[PDB]
Subunit: 494 residues, 4 copies
Amino acid sequence: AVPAPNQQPEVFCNQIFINNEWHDAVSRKTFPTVNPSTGEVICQVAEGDKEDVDKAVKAARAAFQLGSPWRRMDASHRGRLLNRLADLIERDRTYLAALETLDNGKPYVISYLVDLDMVLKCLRYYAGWADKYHGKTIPIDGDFFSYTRHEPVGVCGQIIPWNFPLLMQAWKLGPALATGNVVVMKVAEQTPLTALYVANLIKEAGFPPGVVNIVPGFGPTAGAAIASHEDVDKVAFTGSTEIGRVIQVAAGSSNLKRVTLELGGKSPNIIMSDADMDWAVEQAHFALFFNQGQCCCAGSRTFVQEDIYDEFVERSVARAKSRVVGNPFDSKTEQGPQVDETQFKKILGYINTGKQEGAKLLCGGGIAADRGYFIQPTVFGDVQDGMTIAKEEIFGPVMQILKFKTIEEVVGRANNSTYGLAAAVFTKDLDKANYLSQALQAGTVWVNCYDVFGAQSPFGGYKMSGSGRELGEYGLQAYTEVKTVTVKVPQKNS
Amino acid sequence: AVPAPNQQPEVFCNQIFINNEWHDAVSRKTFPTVNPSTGEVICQVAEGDKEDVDKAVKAARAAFQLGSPWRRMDASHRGRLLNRLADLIERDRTYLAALETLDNGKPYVISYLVDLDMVLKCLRYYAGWADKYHGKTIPIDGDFFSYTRHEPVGVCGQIIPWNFPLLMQAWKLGPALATGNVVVMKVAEQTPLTALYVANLIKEAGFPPGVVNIVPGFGPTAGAAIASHEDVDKVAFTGSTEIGRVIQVAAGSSNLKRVTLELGGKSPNIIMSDADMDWAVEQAHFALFFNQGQCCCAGSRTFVQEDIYDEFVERSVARAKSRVVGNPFDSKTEQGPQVDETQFKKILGYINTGKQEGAKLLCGGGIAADRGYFIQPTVFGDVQDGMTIAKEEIFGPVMQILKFKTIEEVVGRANNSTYGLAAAVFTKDLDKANYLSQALQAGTVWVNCYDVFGAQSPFGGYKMSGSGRELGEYGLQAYTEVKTVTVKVPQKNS
Amino acid sequence: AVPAPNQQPEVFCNQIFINNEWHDAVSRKTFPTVNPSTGEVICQVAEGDKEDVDKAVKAARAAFQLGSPWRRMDASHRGRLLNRLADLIERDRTYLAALETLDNGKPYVISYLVDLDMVLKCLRYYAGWADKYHGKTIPIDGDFFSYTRHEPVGVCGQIIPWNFPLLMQAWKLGPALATGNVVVMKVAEQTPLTALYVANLIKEAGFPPGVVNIVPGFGPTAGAAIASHEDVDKVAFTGSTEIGRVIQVAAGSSNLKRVTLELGGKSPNIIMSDADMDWAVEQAHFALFFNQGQCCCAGSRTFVQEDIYDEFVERSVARAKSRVVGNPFDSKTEQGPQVDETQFKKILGYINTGKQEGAKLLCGGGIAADRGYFIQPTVFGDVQDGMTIAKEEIFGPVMQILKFKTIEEVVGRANNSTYGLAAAVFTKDLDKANYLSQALQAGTVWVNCYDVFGAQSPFGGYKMSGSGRELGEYGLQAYTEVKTVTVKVPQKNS
Amino acid sequence: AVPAPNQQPEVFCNQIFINNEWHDAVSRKTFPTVNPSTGEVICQVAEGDKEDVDKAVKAARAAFQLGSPWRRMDASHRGRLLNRLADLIERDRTYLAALETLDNGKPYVISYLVDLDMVLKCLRYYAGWADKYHGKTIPIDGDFFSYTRHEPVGVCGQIIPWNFPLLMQAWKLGPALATGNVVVMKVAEQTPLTALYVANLIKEAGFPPGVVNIVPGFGPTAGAAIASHEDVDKVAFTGSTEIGRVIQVAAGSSNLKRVTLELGGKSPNIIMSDADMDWAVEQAHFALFFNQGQCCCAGSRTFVQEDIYDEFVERSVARAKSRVVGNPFDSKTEQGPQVDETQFKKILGYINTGKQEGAKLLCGGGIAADRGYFIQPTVFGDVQDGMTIAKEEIFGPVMQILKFKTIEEVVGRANNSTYGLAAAVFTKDLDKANYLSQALQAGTVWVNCYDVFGAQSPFGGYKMSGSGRELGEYGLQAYTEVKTVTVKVPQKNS
Ligand code: NA
Ligand code: NA
Ligand code: NA
Ligand code: NA
């Protein structure tokens, strides 16, 4: 049930968004954003830098001042605004989905039915949280009345990646706005278009000027300025584990701003011998290949018990070979192109790395088309723990299938990683499910499923996959600053 | 390692407890409490009535007055007092265990390792809640500061049964005292001794006079007076569904006091064909025969899938036949006598009904000794849903085994009851486990286990098995009165 | 900025609402609903009795069956439906506000700006709660995984009054529908029209058939049938303290259904000598006269500190003498007619009683118009605690002003009541405010304000003013049935 | 009632605590700890370095392994252990209070009645949290069962200061141990003795080996070793804002461990003209001079409304001049010496600067004794915001009194700081209290009181005074790692 797409949507926003208005970079510089399916330039976008970040931060700080419209506004009204933003996004759903695909490369059907659906659900969920994150009245010792106020953390710098442009924007804005914070957001240079159009909707929804400011540009410039800014109270970064370290260092070198990170992974998908074969094979395929393999929690280590290995691999290879690669605007297309040339080459390198390491190439392993950044669904068999393709995040359509014998063994191998974002277990046994879900050191453990995200369930990593949680009630903690008020009273009574 | 018992523990307390003092009934009347193992009178106990209840309520009301030691006391200190009471109970553990057995009939080993261990864990668990049940600061619309105060509900009338004398006392005192309430407790005429001794430990612990008042006596007199009292704010009753109805009506007919009930049940224990036979058989036995079958959540309807029915029944009969009945102070004894003559005769009557209606008597069926209220471990097979023994709570060592074919069938049959206190599922399959735990209309659903109680987890019934929950955080709800305080402020800000 | 009202709005709904269909009463009997401003009959309404309630309960039970559209529906979608309902009600705001005024008598401007605004805020508030009322994962002892499911209580009987027809309906449906329950609502015979039209919007919004069934009729018939029904799981009642007892007795006499009550009061509004005179006088006026004085938490006992007594009374009389009484559809009207003849006469009786017992009549005291049920704003000075008008709920435009000297004194006099729905304190002093808000035995204590309701803050009474709380997160407690699921695991670890 | 102290308590522990055993530093080096009251060496303490920290981390990691005694231990038992530890500390209360005074310098009476009392209260409070920090069951979309496990964060590195040796240790251990984490603690080189003795009690209490590890030593060595360790999962640092930045940079440069900081401040104590003069004078004195002015939240900026300035200052000066400085073991002593020579000199430097910049020296201003690190109670009047002594944390007995006129003025001047740990407001006015408590940007706002700490109320700073909160329920957040488990089920129902 998908409406026909406009395969060449018009672009209306390509500037810096500050105080509900559009601005060119101070430098007047602009950068081209490319269509990964064709390798052609879509349009040019204002290149924000430190001076532009400074302007955004000031606007946000001004909007956060005591007595301002955003500060005085009823919590419930913040809820009304988020719900209005969601309605506007829904009104322009067909357009946003098409634009999302044009700039990112993912199939339009997926942008429409998945990405935008989750954006709506995310904003609508958080709109409901606006006036329900209560503080506490505390039974402190002595003749006192003690309580806590859950106040907004303040100016929040949010940096989002390119794999899920609109969704990542929603995951950030939802909890921050619901709790009354102000935002300075840095969108990915590879996919700035959809986020900038949403800014138009933010103004249309009635949000006071300066509550949400978006600055497109690059990381070493715009992103770094936000992380090192002396007046940004909190920063939330989603991207690579490498840059996450840069962000936290910047925060510690500046004003000690609160930090939360959502980084990458090398998530283990464990297939026990008693699992439903047909379901496990389809879910394992989805777990890895979804969104051109460009998912932080991709099931990149498919552990399969030795007794069902041969069959599982045979079916996985057949599924990989049938996966249609092509024009994301074509309904038959399952896999579009990678996001850009840099990623395209990085994946080709990892594919060659696997071949050099001795991993058995079962299918694919090369370029899928001459134009664009298309890579053939690739499957590696007999992968070993010590192999690079088994340790490092590839972020592409490259599957690793490993073999194991016992349940105690797989736990140790699954946990033997610096990453710990997600994990999965496929089994029909009650005990094995509980044994594994408890033992796996990962932020999310899916049982008989994969990539099941709910705005109400927290998401985040263990170890170096990140810190802090997004989504759910937990997603509000990082956007709250706690204040204790302890008042002397004549005589405290229970 | 169970310390040797004093098979004839001396009785030190047998009067009405009010304001930390011992009083005879105003009428000066006394009733005998019998040792169910011999049928001989242990001692005489003060027979409280309306006038005695009136004295206790006034004492409790006085102790609840604003500015009183109990009202002004720091919440954290209430916890210290609760832990102190627990330490005193642990000091007198062997004595209380022996006294529990003497008056109740349950095996001394069980009173020691089970009942008293749970009493200590319950009291210590609630001690920790004392200063942690926070109220809220609410982000209401307009220029206001709104918050809630979690105040004690007040004078709490608590009526407890005879199956777990010390434990039921703890389940009531823990939450009530942890939240700063005052208590007027009515203990069972069949088992008043142990609770009265605890009242002495409550005084030794240092609880202010009037905080806990215990009035031994009969139901139609002392209990009814509590339920109809115009100055009792909340009543908590544990007993038969029949009397539960009397309690709610009395509350409505009097001062509209808050009510919570923990009533009977006809809990189904469902054994799927893929269950572990040895474990399922042993757990099904415990599920029904525990504490002389005198448990509210007893698995009195053992549903077994047809493919394993014959074998399950065989093993169950063998286990029941090996069950050692005898002197509760004997370490070999698994089963002591029933609480009294009334119960003794009720059970024999139910066994008779089982025979008349065509249920297959597989073992037991009669008296187990010439002295004492001892009944043989009885097992009925081929029981049908329409049989009296399949519908009514027997509260004795009488096992009902029913046969079923499908999972859909057993859900309907298990839920076809006015009761809904507990239920269990024995299976190795993840889906079946989750399907059943969700579908079963019961307060507690145990998977691959039975009678697993934790002070942390709530317990209570669905339908006519009661209302409200005891234990866990939920256990505090019925003992809290919420007050909203909304203050006008110069100008509200987030 | 209120839209011009249609002073004679057409009635589209006047039958029984079951399974999203309109039905005549089984007996075919109807009853007249009158316009209290003219005394003329508006239209006939189906008179539901026990047989109709039975039909409604069966429809609700069917809609609640496991696997039904309402049970399988995502919690978030329930929120979506509640928001859709609010949107439909907002679309027909002017119509509903006029119809509310026609049937109830309250000023149109108030219906539009206050009642409907609050209805919209209540429904939208709870829409956000639909997927956020989490159960718990509990760290129980032993090798077990214990958790709780917050399930719907089931078929909920809801009986609402005539003072705030639409608002009371929202307070009930909001929390019930957000938690997934099904409803059988009984509306007041005096104001059934608006609630029936809303039922038409519930059908339009997309709620499955049977989820909400409305049965108009009388109390001793339809109301009692609900309270005594064997298949109703929970009953929520709002009305007199007298009928509240009937409801609780009916529940205990039937299936032991869960009960919550919102009854009346005689709320004390305490004015300390350091209070802002102008503010306190106006708020005290609003505190009593709001909604023709037909408010459960009306400040019917105005305590004024002796040093400012004379001036306060002086200003209060001047305010009561200038209060405009007249046609509710005229923008100048502050006070419309009382709901019906029974109330009209009852209020005149209280005024006569006040004069008989020595209260000083300062203004008003009689009929305000020859047509309709209009009463003059009446003020009584020098009222004493023992006077009838100082103890009984009048539910009319009759103000009681009492004089006091000390703060300790007023606390005792304020708390010397069987009621405890609400109270207020007017003072500039921090300690006095904290001292009084703590000491006052009332469900809601307002400081320097009155009648400040927020969908985020709980409302309910102490003592005989009721039990349980509505609004806020607390409003969800009574609509949830807790189930503990304790699963045996191989080896539990923290 | 303070027991006679042993003015020269013996030292029994002076080594590195690993796996419940006492070790010498790998290098065999030791460092002296001085008695600030005499400047003499108490004893030598093992000087821990990177190699010693590595050993501790390994021991902690081992004790944290899945299946270990600490991981398998019931949550309730962790509470039993914390309570047992508290009982042992109470048993050795007199000894510890004396040792604390010997190593730190604070008055014995204070160490006994305040520090140890709070230590006991902190451990007992958190003992109650051990089995009550529930995860959640989440109503996610689709046919899934989603829930969260609150798991321990893992190996926690904790670095505490010298101002409140025993209390700071308790603040760290309480929440960490209650949640099941393992600890590697670095104590202050100036006050390592008491913490080391408590380690003996930790072993005596029954805590498994490796659960708590204490490495005495220096910050640039041991401290940096902890913050930079690749296997430490979380770090909590309390001390100067300067070192705090080093800690967050180290964390981001290493393994992205989770961090929380409790740094310094320059907390404003606002005295409004309507404040209780006597109470405000005594509380303002306590606000600054408590613990030799060595408190992170010291009210080092005393703002006094012009109308009462002269009188307030006069009484303040008289109070400061009567403050008894001397031997901490003498019951007459109010102020002992400063912790060490470094602080002693730094404070004298600040007093010199105060005189240099124009602040009016009202009393004291120099050394109070020729032996030890005693400084006279110093009061500076007419201090201006730009002055160094009004901006920098002195951490000594130096009081700054500023004059102001309006409430808007004081808010801005109070908030014009990089710090935001605490604040106080002294006023009898309700509106003034609410206005100020909301507007002030500080972690804790005391009204009509100061330094009111409750184990149940959170404490932490805004801006650069730190991040995260300690104490109360909030203190558990930083020691918890959230894991979402999403399970596919046959058919989801509410
Ligand atoms: Na996979
Ligand atoms: Na007995
Ligand atoms: Na039984
Ligand atoms: Na009417």
